[PDB]
Amino acid sequence: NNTASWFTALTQHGKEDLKFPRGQGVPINTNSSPDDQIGYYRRATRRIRGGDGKMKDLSPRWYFYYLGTGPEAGLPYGANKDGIIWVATEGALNTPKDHIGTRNPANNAAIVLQLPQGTTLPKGFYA
DNA sequence: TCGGACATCGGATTGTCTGA
């Protein structure tokens, strides 16, 4: 409603869940420092009614949140939770990114998620 | 101004229109 990821989601089109090699996965963001570049993706799988009136489960969306923000703001980095994967630029600081926070869609459009050139993605995520 | 309806999932964590 009024709290969202700063970024569009990575859509999972295949069987493989999202995951990244250590050091990879944090979006580009000119308002972020390297110390800021740590957080998680959270999976959201929606069940919706199609135009034929039949229900269907859409491809999962994985949204990025900086550490200590968003729906799992209280989770420490590395905590095991289904549908949460952790990412950090090497050397990022293990502190909540309060000053970045989350996005209010009434005030700001999402940034289309950009990963660093050469980032590895699992099959079924489109690059 | 702003809440809400609705689309067909693209972006619904939006886009678009518009009644109130």
Residue numbers in the entry: 47 to 173
Give verbatim lines from the article.
The N-NTD of SARS-CoV-2 plays a critical role in LLPS and viral RNP assembly. Here, we show that a compact stem-loop DNA aptamer binds tightly to SARS-CoV-2 N-NTD.
The A58-20 aptamer binds to a highly positively charged concave surface of N-NTD, which was shown by earlier NMR studies to be involved in RNA-binding. Consistent with the biochemical observations above, N-NTD engages the hexanucleotide loop of the aptamer, whereas the flanking sequences form a double-stranded stem pointed away from the protein. The cytosine base at the 2nd position (C2) forms bidentate hydrogen bonds with Arg92, consistent with the reduced affinity of the C2-to-G variant. The thymine base at the 6th position (T6) is flipped out of the loop and π-stacked against Tyr109, where it is stabilized by hydrogen bonding to the main chain nitrogen atom of Ser51 and the side chains of Arg88 and Tyr111, explaining the critical role of this base and the loss of affinity for the T6-to-A variant. Tyr109 is also hydrogen-bonded to the backbone phosphate and thus appears to be a key residue in the interface.
